[PDB]
A paper describes a structure:
The E protein is a class II fusion protein and the largest of the structural proteins. It is the main protein responsible for receptor binding and fusion, as well as the major target for neutralizing antibodies. The prM protein is a precursor that is cleaved by the host cell protease furin into mature M protein and a pr peptide.
Langat virus (LGTV) is a tick isolate with naturally low pathogenicity in mice. It has approximately 85% amino acid identity with TBEV and is often used in research as a biosafety level 2 model virus of more pathogenic tick-borne flaviviruses. We determined the structures of LGTV and chimeric LGTVT:prME using cryogenic electron microscopy (cryo-EM) and three-dimensional image reconstruction. The electron micrographs of virus preparations contained mainly intact spherical virions with a size of ~50 nm in diameter, along with some broken particles. We generated a 3.22 Å resolution map of LGTVT:prME and a 3.82 Å resolution map of LGTV. We compared both atomic models to the previously published model of TBEV isolate Kuutsalo-14 (25). The new models included two extra residues in the C-terminus of the E protein (residues 495 and 496), and the LGTVT:prME model has one more residue in the C-terminus of the M protein (residue 75). Both structures are consistent with those of TBEV, with the root mean square deviation (RMSD) of Cα atoms across protein chains below 0.7 Å for the E proteins and below 1.5 Å for the M proteins. When grown in A549 Mavs-/- cells, LGTVT:prME particles contained different glycan structures at this position, identified as complex type (17%), hybrid structures (27%), and oligomannose type (56%). The main complex-type glycan was biantennary digalactosylated with core fucosylation, including GlcNAc with core fucosylation, whereas the LGTV and LGTVT:prME resolve only the innermost GlcNAc of the N-linked glycan at position N154.
Residue numbers in the entry:
A (entry chain A), C (entry chain B), E (entry chain C): 1 to 496
B (entry chain D), D (entry chain E), F (entry chain F): 1 to 74
Write the structure that this text describes.
């Protein structure tokens, strides 16, 4: 399992004869997939990447200057000029200056002065924008069955199966050996919108920075610094990063506003990280919609003999998983292969079994086996495996489980957005209602207020509620109170 | 030249993030910093509101808004 | 006359027979001094400086990091430790990470993790404060008489004399050659306030930056950056520029917030420049109240004959000075040591001489001479020099003359503050009233509102006026209305 | 980090200033530059005050404040 | 005489208790001066000029386009660039052309197209500005005595004298031969306002075109055409005369906007002419305010004997001058030199001689003489010369004569402006009142409304008067009626 | 001499056209661009109209024709 190794899990279950389930896989999340009388699977999203993406804007974060020149004219003899006003990679400025007989002039008054300098970016201080192509994005999704073996996060499991998806792959069939085959179907058009996305890259040589950042498309085009596209030797708008002093009668000073890197790194705020591996560019935040087909799964070992109850030993004693399940491991010294007798008892009635096993029909094979995961009611229990017995106390209460599941639901909804209704979906009418309401209300808030800052949104929400308190009509008063409450829900209700 | 703050309904996606944003819990530290650094002035806003505004609820709200806004402009 | 080479100038007249004048000399400005029957002298302030000033706080603008370490402990094993946690020169952080069987812990849940990194400033990325000592500051003041020669702004005028003042001195007499002796008294009290100014230095060797900035004293102590005093081997508060990633199971990332130089250079917008040249640290702003005594000056050459009226020629035609005076230069071929009989006449009246000569008793001499400056009434005029004549028109009006002097009065009053009342020795009762009222009224605004931003000051002034319109008591209403008007005057006079 | 902007009153004088700064001589151009991009922005701020607020003097000052604050709203 | 030959003639009169008279010489006018006992003079201004005036802006009126270059890029493959975008004298444009799959692109949608063209003015299609220099203007004024010989405006009269005036010129003395001397002085600085004037020139080789125009200075700076100063190869705003067609997929066409010369010539409606003589540049409008001092003038021939009455003949019979006076010429056959007896008798009044002679004491001399000019009262008259007679009827009446003088007075005022009050050295107090009132009202109207067009000046005046009739207060009504009516009274003189 | 232009109803098909063959786009961009030249001209005309006209509807409406004509005379 990888679900045992991760901070986050969700569970799905199909009733008997259910052939398809709908999943909304998030990067770094995982799903435990089950159906009545069929073997369980772990499913997760493993990467979202491209090789050699297309370039866009380059920006300069720190200017270098050379070879400056100056010229000036007296108040009568017209505007001053220099050859370097008409050449590539130059920045120039022209202004009036004070003049008189003391400076060897003809007459007292305002003259004119002109100044020129060569401009270039400091050798490693470039910022590069990159953009993905929908025709070349690869999504990687992986599956492993609960074989009953255990393998660490830094070890490779032979039962693990891998698949890759683009605009040009159909319903895939993946084979899992004795367990049969599983069918998997991506919809790459449902992924993170490329039109909102850019990948920002600075110097890769820094030991103590992220290698890339998942910046928004609009913000990256409104940046004020000097810029170009690839292959050009000249810089556009080079006058953004130098400024010139007040003139003296015969000279003027040019000043460099210095390395902007600290301004950029503070301005990025909460933006998600990305990473680079040679030619490969990975996103590290995003989601995919997919269908999993439970069409051809076999329950392994239904023909196997049951174990001798006496020859079991604990390999790893019972522990709380932190996901409200109990996990344990057993070692067995008899003949193999064989099937493990398991049950759990409420401490007061020995006739009733309460073990909800999440790995159906568990077995010992020649090479390995004997991991078990189970869920139990709250309070005292006895757990049995063969003639071994152990005493346990499951924490919490029935109210605690519905609260914890409710929290996971709300936390998913405020990250997936309107796609959150597709998880484990069924043809019930409410699946249309929820997706419609989120399309309407989400469309309203994003179009009306989407670009407004967090504290400004709170001030607007308070002002709109306060207009609701003060205005003279009771229906419109309530409408201003409710709509102010929506802006506060989209801010203080997101976090405070 | 300035660079605008990026912070919004971003490409959120549940992974690791760069340094988290100066929301209300952080903004109150900027208010406390200005109240300490500008101490001798701070009585004036409270004294004027206490003289000028009738009703304790709107009086308190006007003082709270004034002190919350001040370090965004000072 | 250096006052012809400069764009800010002022004129002072001793009332008949008065021995002493009080001058508020202002850096890079100049004043021309005049009195009945006595030669005219130009006085100006050339430098304010010290050698090797006192060194205060140092700040780090770009952190450089080495020797990262991390250690972690299994859930309930008890908290982690590393030798570096107690040492100087390192930043350490402690946090919780999730652990389980997939990463070799015995129990699932929250573990504990700690990380350490060594901290330094990059070799030239320091920022350093310096402070002036009242016992060591040196003022240089310079004087030249109007000899009737003309000398360029880049030539050594032999008539120029210099005096150096320190708190260890007060009075000096300068010999002017033929013109006799002039007396000058300085005080180091009522100079630039040494208790409120700091000189800030970055790297002195950059070709395209000022060498120093004249930062305010409170500012350089309200900063939030890594800092130390001289000679110390380790920095205080190094956590200001290093920050750490949220833990993985068994790792934490260390990140560098990068070079702050551009953030600092942006933040100092509006502060005046300073410069460092060799061992000396000059200011390029300030003022001094000095007393000049004119008891011992002599008019040169009252005994000479007048020129032959036939032998004059023009060397420069009459030209506008930009200071509302006329300047000219003449050439001659008679026996050289003789007086030039200059006069001017207004059109429509007899030859009453209207030329107020600012240089009295102009002559040629064997070494040179022949430069004149004068003031004339508005409208059509003719100027005569023996048999030479030139027609002229003087711009503006008798009202405009008063408005132009009024503007320069308002500029001095706002730029120099309370000391502006000390200009001119005619100490009538209104001068003491102004000095007292400015001390009281200026002290109130500068202590109550002084540090507040320019816009929120205006918004407060508007608020006190808005409230003043609404007060029911007429005395309180007028007080609030006046206070709003005062805050608006105290701001908007400095707003453009 | 958050180094603030230096105050505009202190160390006034006739020497070269480093950069132009941010007094009302600058800020009035920033208000017009916001408005001529966002052409409808002042319409509701003037119209709602003209409909809702009694007394010309407080109405006009409320409009002046609402426009003076404008480039800080985003 | 010259005053016989030009239609703008005027007469200045007085008594020798005042010897100084003030004249306003207008270029293309003539003035006659007369007084008790002293001879009459003809006075005029003959040319205002400079040699080689200062050159300023040159403008291009016909573009030559050459060497055009085009480039384009596929929809996503970045914007295009050309080397010619970074060279002198080159006009460039950039646009989003359409592209598609059939035009060799890999995608639908907008691409990029860029185009460059090189620019020069065509040979001899320049327009040039010139400006006068105050220290180098020459004004030429001429005087001749009313000799009583006659010469046409064709040959050169021997009695004529000429004097040139510049900013460095005195109360000059002109030696009028036998008639003694006249004294002459000029307000050179207060003629034409050189702050207003530019002299505009096209090429010199054209036939029908005027040589130069007296354009206004502000108008000359708002011309929306390409420009430079001397010695430069680049043209500023070269894009004014070229525009580009909406792109095809792989071409964009430059359009030459063509020779503008007719639009310039059609714009300079109502602007006075000027002319050029190798290196002199002459104005053909404007005026000087001037003094003549009559102190040293002498009468001629007063000791001669009277003619013997029978020896006269008419040579040119009494005829109407077109300027009130009557003119005649006589041939005489007696001894010379001698005095011609002249008188005129009003019908029925033989006791009084009514002849006002414009030339005092007419004499024949050995080389020439015998022209006479006189003024007579209206109606039936008899003219006598020796014992010859001629009958005459003099047109008009005293009321019509006052109206004719009043018309010329209004024509002086409406073209000289505020200077019109200098004509004749009248000491009466009302002259100061009229001078002040016109100066105030003219300054107010010119500074408030001066540049507004004829129709909007009328519409403004009418609108204020009509609003005045609609006002709900009688004092405000009268203020709107007055302010509307004054604009019309200041402006209705133009035309239709 | 004069050679006055024509528009609106010689209207050719979807082919290329000569430079800036439009009236409403030109008049709108001219009117909105002119406001920077002289504020006091339109401000004083608006102030006089706001004082002189009786009833808010005609007081608002009548000014539009004058401002539509204004750039033909300035
Ligand atoms: C109330 C709690 C209901 C169960 C639950 O926890 O419902 C939540 C769903 O409602 C929420 O998040 C909002 C709960 C507000 C209280 C988790 O449902 P789920 O994990 O199956 O997500 C998919 C469920 N769709 C298809 C219905 C979205
Ligand atoms: C009113 C608008 C409600 C929109 C909505 O129900 O939006 C919900 C959040 O609703 C709330 O927390 C308030 C619900 C109560 C109102 C989903 O959007 P999100 O911003 O939380 O998703 C994360 C941002 N991505 C999708 C761009 C990554
Ligand atoms: C020119 C008429 C005086 C202009 C002026 O406002 O001058 C002002 C004084 O008068 C004012 O009303 C100031 C009003 C504002 C406070 C500056 O006088 P000041 O430049 O000579 O400075 C020295 C003036 N003591 C000789 C009287 C010290
Ligand atoms: C233009 C503004 C002229 C007035 C002015 O500038 O008036 C202000 C405040 O009004 C007054 O003192 C009015 C009362 C005078 C008696 C002068 O003192 P200040 O506030 O500029 O402080 C001192 C100057 N520093 C800020 C440069 C250090
Ligand atoms: C239009 C081209 C006119 C050329 C011409 O011939 O201009 C002359 C000169 O116009 C002017 O001085 C008009 C100056 C207006 C300012 C036509 O008038 P005018 O020959 O009688 O001389 C001028 C005789 N005033 C002075 C009595 C009219
Ligand atoms: C009729 C000829 C004179 C027109 C004239 O003098 O018209 C105006 C009005 O001048 C006045 O002194 C009006 C005084 C009213 C009292 C001045 O000329 P302007 O600005 O219309 O034309 C450019 C200048 N020029 C004609 C000399 C080339």
């Amino acid at each position: 399992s990888r679900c045992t190794h991760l901070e986050n899990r969700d569970f799905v279950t199909g009733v008997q004869g259910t052939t398809r389930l709908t999943l909304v896989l998030e990067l770094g999340g995982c799903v435990t997939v089950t159906a009545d009388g069929k073997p369980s699977l772990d499913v997760w999203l493993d990467s979202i990447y491209q090789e050699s993406p297309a370039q866009t804007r380059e920006y300069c974060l720190h200017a270098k200057l050379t070879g400056t020149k100056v010229a000036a004219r007296c108040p009568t003899m017209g505007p001053a000029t220099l050859p370097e006003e008409h050449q590539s990679g130059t920045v120039c400025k022209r202004d009036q200056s004070d003049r008189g007989w003391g400076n060897h002039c003809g007459l007292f008054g305002k003259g004119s002065i002109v100044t020129c300098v060569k401009f270039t970016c400091e050798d490693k201080k470039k910022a590069t924008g990159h953009v993905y192509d929908v025709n070349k994005i690869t999504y990687t999704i992986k599956v492993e069955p609960h074989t009953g073996e255990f393998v660490a996060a830094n070890e490779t499991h032979s039962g693990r199966k891998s698949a890759s998806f683009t605009v040009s792959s159909e319903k895939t069939i993946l084979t899992l050996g004795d367990y049969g085959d599983v069918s998997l179907l991506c919809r790459v058009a449902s992924g993170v919108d490329l039109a909102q996305t850019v990948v920002l890259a600075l110097d890769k040589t820094h030991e103590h920075l992220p290698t890339a950042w998942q910046v928004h498309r609009d913000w990256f085009n409104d940046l004020a610094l000097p810029w170009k596209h690839d292959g050009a030797e000249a810089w556009n708008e080079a006058g953004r990063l130098v400024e010139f002093g007040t003139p003296h009668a015969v000279k003027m000073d040019v000043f460099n506003l210095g390395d902007q890197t600290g301004v950029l790194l503070k301005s990025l705020a909460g933006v998600p990280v990305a990473s680079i591996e040679g030619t490969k560019y990975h996103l590290k935040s995003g989601h995919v919609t997919c269908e999993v087909g439970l069409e051809k799964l076999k329950m392994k070992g239904l023909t196997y003999t049951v174990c001798d109850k006496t020859k079991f030993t604990w390999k790893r004693a019972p522990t709380d998983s932190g996901h409200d399940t109990v996990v344990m491991e057993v070692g067995f010294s008899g003949t193999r292969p064989c099937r493990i007798p398991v049950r759990a008892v409420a401490h007061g009635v020995p006739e009733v079994n309460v073990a909800m096993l999440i790995t159906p029909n568990p077995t010992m094979e020649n090479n390995g086996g004997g991991f078990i995961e189970m869920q139990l009611p709250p309070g005292d229990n006895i757990i049995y495996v063969g003639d071994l017995n152990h005493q346990w106390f499951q924490k919490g209460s029935s109210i605690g489980r519905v609260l914890q599941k409710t929290r996971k639901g709300i936390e998913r909804l405020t990250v997936l957005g309107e796609h959150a209704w597709d998880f484990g979906s069924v043809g019930g009418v409410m699946t249309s209602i929820g997706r419609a309401m989120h399309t309407v209300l989400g469309g309203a808030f994003n179009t009306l207020l989407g670009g407004v800052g967090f504290l400004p949104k709170i001030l607007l929400g308070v002002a709109m509620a306060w207009l609701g308190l003060n205005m003279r009509n009771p229906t419109l008063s309530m409408g201003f109170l409710l709509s102010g409450g929506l802006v506060l829900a989209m801010t203080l209700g997101v976090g405070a | 030249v300035l660079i605008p703050s990026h912070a919004q309904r971003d490409l959120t996606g549940r992974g690791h993030q760069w340094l988290e944003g100066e929301a209300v819990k952080a903004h109150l530290t900027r208010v406390e910093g200005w109240v300490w650094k500008n101490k001798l002035f701070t009585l004036s806003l409270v004294m004027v509101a206490w003289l000028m505004v009738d009703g304790l609820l709107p009086r308190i709200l006007i003082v709270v808004v004034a002190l919350a806004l001040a370090p965004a402009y000072a």
